[PDB]
Amino acid sequence: MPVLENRAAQGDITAPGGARRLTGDQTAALRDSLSDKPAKNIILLIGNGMGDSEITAARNYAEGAGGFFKGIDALPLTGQYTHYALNKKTGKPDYVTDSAASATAWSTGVKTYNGALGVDIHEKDHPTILEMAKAAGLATGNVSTAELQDATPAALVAHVTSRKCYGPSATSEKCPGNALEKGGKGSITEQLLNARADVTLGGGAKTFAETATAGEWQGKTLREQAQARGYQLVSDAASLNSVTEANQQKPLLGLFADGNMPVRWLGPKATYHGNIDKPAVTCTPNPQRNDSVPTLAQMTDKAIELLSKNEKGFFLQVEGASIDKQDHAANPCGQIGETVDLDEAVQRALEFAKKEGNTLVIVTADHAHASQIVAPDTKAPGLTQALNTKDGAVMVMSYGNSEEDSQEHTGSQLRIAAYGPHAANVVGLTDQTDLFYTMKAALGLK
Amino acid sequence: MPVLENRAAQGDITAPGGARRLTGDQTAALRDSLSDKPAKNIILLIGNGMGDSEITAARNYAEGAGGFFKGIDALPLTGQYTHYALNKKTGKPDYVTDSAASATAWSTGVKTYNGALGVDIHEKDHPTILEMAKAAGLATGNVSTAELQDATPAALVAHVTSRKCYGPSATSEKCPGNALEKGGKGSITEQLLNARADVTLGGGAKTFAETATAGEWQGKTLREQAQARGYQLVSDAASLNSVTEANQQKPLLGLFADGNMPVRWLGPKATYHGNIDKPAVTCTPNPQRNDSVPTLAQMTDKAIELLSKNEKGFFLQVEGASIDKQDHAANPCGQIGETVDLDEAVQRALEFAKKEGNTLVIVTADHAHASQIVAPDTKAPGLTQALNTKDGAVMVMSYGNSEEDSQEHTGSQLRIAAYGPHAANVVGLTDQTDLFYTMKAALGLK
Ligand SMILES: [Mg+2]
Ligand SMILES: [Mg+2]
Ligand SMILES: [Zn+2]
Ligand SMILES: [Zn+2]
């Protein structure tokens, strides 16, 4: 199936037809993109908080307005999907979701309240697409740049009434019903160790330092439990590259940072009237990110390599987490750099899929964020910053939907694109929960 | 070709799979939506400033979060498109376009600077899709709820260096090179009268009261000139319904209001901390809305009827203008009501297209706006308001990208959806200029 090779402005932006992205009619290419045959594998790439605005800002800065992200923009089937949550007490819609509810929606097929993981408004557990995939025998992978206990990666393997329930200690006071010592299934980190996906890579080594309050591994740190349960623990790129196999007998657990893995690009924080009073910024590569710390692209590629050895097929979810984090921190450079980071991973995925032929690749976000691209002369009430793009022009970003600590989320529907068998299911308007059913039906799971 | 009959949440939002909008695999339906055959007609519906956020806000309020706009959401082929303009002096991209440059982009196929109409950065005129369609012998219609002189409807029939050049007087001092008395082609209203589309319906009767400074009709008001040039002048719904034919011999010109046509819904303006300090708002129908003033749906339906009598085919552009106007005025109810209004016109277009079979219907916006849907408890620096949705829940809207007077535009890419032959060309990432080429090619124009 054809992948959009190039959708950059074809010529001189200033001349007639020079800004065009199409070189001819697309009917035939679209026909060839449609297939209902079964999917052997599925790679779901999530850009945390990556709505259309974030994609545009990143493209403008890193590739120029007439540019083209080889990964993110290359998926042929596109659509828009709704991601509202539910109010726990009333059951009515709550228009602006958080990452927990949204992650639950696509991972279990049911709407829930803000902050829940793998449970509905009645606090009932529902099997995740990963658990189901593992049950059917497929290999499973879960990769992220955030703390593995964070919402997005946690939703696939944990069922807790509150996302804050990272380890034993926090769970005991915030999720008493889930607390291990109270007959619950355990904390997020604990349920993660139980779920046993073949490949799990990301940050969050900190919580693994906690000690189990009850159960078979009481007294032992969660890391010791991992080792004792046969997990292959990796903590740097070198070690990651050395892994030859990862399976149920010896699952891979890569903890590359105590918390969130390092951001790719550094830049100052947006300030009040920053586009007016401060000069234009040019982002700079983060020097503390390490040749020893794998990038999302490397983690993705390795994961694909190990997971592909299972002839049954595989399910892999990859998350570019810090797009959302930096967006919250009103830091344009960090936000854009993580989007660029995600793009590289989408490329890795698309390459593998293009040759394998039976892989469904999906790129989307969990929810919309606050960043907006405004006129250079804008006098906004919030935080702003001017950036020097690849076009050699200035672009101004504004974060003005919150006064408090962190810029907030928004309820706008957002882009979802797909490539491979069953991709037609992301076209037009759909809901985040349809994604669970699309992945399930594509994999022929029951 | 199938039209999305229903993509509303199929069941109980709170139950597994109840939020789903899909009821089965879409591959086959999408395959049936692909056709490369020639388009006999084209109906372009523009929601001024109607980005994904505006669409979601209006859907949440009027149809509920799991609801479905029968028009707007019913188009099967969807994608996102870029609309940046150019800096006149440098020729580099200017990330946030205004309505003039964007309307110029799709109407002529060339990028331009903010404020320009039908001319490039060198101020050179370029033929519009309407002029070209009229030349090839097709019937043409230009419909809007704004003053006919405003950017969107003007771009199809006028070529001036500044959008402010409404009539003789303003032209003489702001567009001297275009001023009739200086050998120019004339003001926006004057060129509109020259272009002679078969059907032109909208507001802006005020400028028609100005008198020609030179030329054959010097001394006469533009209204008199219209009458003298054989135009059928209509000023209300009754007269409009009475028109039996509209052609080059007797073109239809409907001036239904002095300026912009009345807004559909009334509601208070968003205020600082309005979601906190004031109660939730329920929009109410504008009593001045009227029985003698045609609605966008009525104008669209009448236009289609008159235009369809030309066997060669027709080109019609319809614009829901006040979506952007109200968005600027930080008035949620006006904004949303105009989106509901546009939806009705999209339904009429789709109905006709569905049965005619050779019509390309495109629905999109010229540029993205400011409005954002934020959490109910949000403490924003700008203007906000709480609304009582059809769900019986509260939705808060934030306007916080400008301090001054008006909320500004944004540069995020936005939704474009299509139905009919050649619709495949709106899928994936495209540029607003590609739309000119898609309509040109579809129509077989040269
Ligand atoms: Mg998130
Ligand atoms: Mg506009
Ligand atoms: Zn967030
Ligand atoms: Zn505007």
Joined together, the tokens standing for residue B222 give 């533009």
How many Cβ atoms sit within 10 Å of the Cβ of residue B24?
10
Separation of alpha carbons B179 and A111, rounded Å: 60
> CA angle B436-B440-B446, nearest 5°?
130
Separation of alpha carbons A142 and A301, rounded Å: 13
**Pick among A22, A102, A104, A440 to test the B interface (most B CBs inside 10 A):** A22
* CA distance to partner chain B, nearest, from residue A427 (Å): 7
Joined together, the tokens standing for residue B100 give 């003039």
Q: Are B307 and B198 in contact (CB under 8 A)?
A: yes
Among candidate residues A195, A226, A196, A184, the one with its CA nearest the CA of residue A209? A226
Q: Are A384 and A273 in contact (CB under 8 A)?
A: yes
Q: Is A183 on the interface with B (CB under 8 A)?
A: no
Joined together, the tokens standing for residue A24 give 């001819």
- C-alpha of residue A184 to centroid of ligand 4, in Å: 54
Find the radius of gyration of the CA atoms of chain B.
Answer: 21
Joined together, the tokens standing for residue B96 give 């946030």
Q: Which amino acid is at B133?
A: A
- C-alpha of residue B136 to centroid of ligand 1, in Å: 52
DSSP letter for each residue of A211-230: BBSSSTTBTSBHHHHHHHTT
Q: Give the neighbor-by-neighbor strand order of the sheet with A394-399.
A: A271-272, A383-388, A394-399, A372-374
Query: Is A99 an annotated catalytic residue?
Result: yes
Through-space distance between the first and last CA atoms of chain B, rounded to whole angstroms? 27
Q: What are the φ and ψ backbone dihedral angles of A184, each rounded to 5 degrees?
A: -80, 175
Find the radius of gyration of the CA atoms of chain A.
Answer: 21
Instruction: Name the residue among B7, B381, B431 with its Cβ closest to that of A428.
Output: B7
Instruction: Name the residue among A13, A53, A437 with its Cβ closest to that of B93.
Output: A13
DSSP letter for each residue of A126-154: ---HHHHHHHTT-EEEEEEEEETTSHHHH
- Residues in A closer than 8 angstroms to B68, CB to CB, are 429
- C-alpha of residue A324 to centroid of ligand 1, in Å: 6
B356 — alpha (psi -120 to 50), left (phi > 0) or beta? alpha
Separation of alpha carbons B261 and B204, rounded Å: 8
Joined together, the tokens standing for residue A215 give 């159960």
CB contact under 8 A, B96 and A379: no
Compute CA B28 distance to the chain's CA centroid, rounded to the nearest angstrom: 32
Resolution of the coordinates in A? Answer: 2.1
Classify A418 as helix, strand or coil.
Answer: strand
Compute CA B128 distance to the chain's CA centroid, rounded to the nearest angstrom: 16
Tell me how the structure was determined.
X-ray
Which residues on neighbouring strands pair with residue B417, listed in sequence order?
B78, B363
- Residues in A closer than 8 angstroms to B26, CB to CB, are 424-425, 427-428
Which residue's structure tokens are 């055959």?
B37
* CA distance to partner chain B, nearest, from residue A380 (Å): 4
Query: Residue B312: exposed, middle, or buried by beta-carbon count in 10 A (0-12, 13-18, 19+)?
Result: exposed
Which residue's structure tokens are 């990651």?
A240
Relative to the alpha carbon of A150, which ligand is closest? Answer: 1
- C-alpha of residue A53 to centroid of ligand 4, in Å: 17
Residues in Cβ contact with B305 at an 8 Å cutoff, skipping those fewer than 6 apart = none
Separation of alpha carbons B333 and B331, rounded Å: 6
Length in residues, chain B:
446
Residues in Cβ contact with B275 at an 8 Å cutoff, skipping those fewer than 6 apart = B376, B377, B378, B384, B385, B386, B396
* CA distance to partner chain B, nearest, from residue A270 (Å): 14
Q: What chain A residue is nearest to B37 in terms of C-alpha separation?
A: A27
Residues in Cβ contact with B277 at an 8 Å cutoff, skipping those fewer than 6 apart = B271
How many Cβ atoms sit within 10 Å of the Cβ of residue B37?
12
Q: E strands within A365-437?
A: 372-374, 383-388, 394-399, 414-419, 428-431
Q: Are B45 and B346 in contact (CB under 8 A)?
A: yes
Separation of alpha carbons B37 and B1, rounded Å: 12
Q: Are A164 and A117 in contact (CB under 8 A)?
A: no
Separation of alpha carbons A198 and A305, rounded Å: 12
Between β-strands A428-431 and A372-374, what pairing exists: parallel, antiparallel or unpaired? unpaired
Separation of alpha carbons A149 and A208, rounded Å: 10
Interface of B with A in 266-305 (CB under 8 A): none
Number of alpha helices (DSSP H) and beta strands (DSSP E) in chain A: 14, 18
Q: Are B347 and B70 in contact (CB under 8 A)?
A: yes
CB contact under 8 A, A26 and B73: no
Which residues on neighbouring strands pair with residue B78, listed in sequence order?
B417
Q: For every residue of chain B, which 3-state class applies, written as one string?
A: CCCCCCCCCCCCCCCCCCCCCCCCCCHHHHHHCCCCCCCCEEEEEEECCCCHHHHHHHHHHHHCCCCCCCCCCCCCEEEEEECCEECCCCCCEECCCCHHHHHHHHHHCCCCECCCECECCCCCECCCHHHHHHHCCCEEEEEEEEECCCHHHHCCCCCECCCCCCCHHHHHHHCCCCCHHHCCCCCHHHHHHHHCCCEEEEECCHHHHCECCCCCCCCCEHHHHHHHCCCEEECCHHHHHHCCCCCCCCCEEEECCCCCCCCCEECCCCEECHHHHCCCECCEECCCCCCCCCCHHHHHHHHHHHHCCCCCCEEEEEEECHHHHHHHCCCHHHHHHHHHHHHHHHHHHHHHHHHHCCEEEEEECCCECCCEEECCCCCCCCEEEEEECCCCCEEEEEECCCCCCCCCCECCCEEEEEECCCHHHHCEEEEHHHHHHHHHHHHCCC
Separation of alpha carbons B255 and B146, rounded Å: 10
Compute CA A97 distance to the chain's CA centroid, rounded to the nearest angstrom: 15
Query: Residue B175: exposed, middle, or buried by beta-carbon count in 10 A (0-12, 13-18, 19+)?
Result: buried
Q: What chain A residue is nearest to B56 in terms of C-alpha separation?
A: A412
DSSP letter for each residue of A250-285: S-EEEE--SSSPPPSEE-PPPEETHHHHSPPB--EE
Which residue's structure tokens are 């829930």?
A112
Classify A364 as helix, strand or coil.
Answer: strand
Which residues on neighbouring strands pair with residue B399, listed in sequence order?
B383
CB contact under 8 A, A373 and B412: yes
Going along chain A from its start, the domains and CATH numbers come out as 1-446 (3.40.720.10)
Among candidate residues B96, B58, B45, the one with its CA nearest the CA of residue B283? B58
Residues in Cβ contact with B73 at an 8 Å cutoff, skipping those fewer than 6 apart = A428, A429, B4, B7, B55, B59
The maximal CA–CA distance of chain B, rounded, in angstroms, is 72
Classify A373 as helix, strand or coil.
Answer: strand
How far CA B284 is from CA of A235, B268, B281, B342, in Å, comes to 60, 10, 9, 17
Joined together, the tokens standing for residue A11 give 């010529």
Which residues on neighbouring strands pair with residue B80, listed in sequence order?
B415, B429
Mutual orientation of helices A52-63 and A332-356 as an angle, nearest 10°?
90
* CA distance to partner chain A, nearest, from residue B161 (Å): 16
Relative to the alpha carbon of B106, which ligand is closest? Answer: 2
Joined together, the tokens standing for residue B145 give 């709820």
Residues in Cβ contact with B364 at an 8 Å cutoff, skipping those fewer than 6 apart = B44, B45, B46, B47, B50, B81, B414, B415, B416, B417, B426, B435
CB contact under 8 A, B34 and A30: yes
Separation of alpha carbons A444 and B401, rounded Å: 47
Separation of alpha carbons B307 and A100, rounded Å: 52
Joined together, the tokens standing for residue A130 give 């990963």
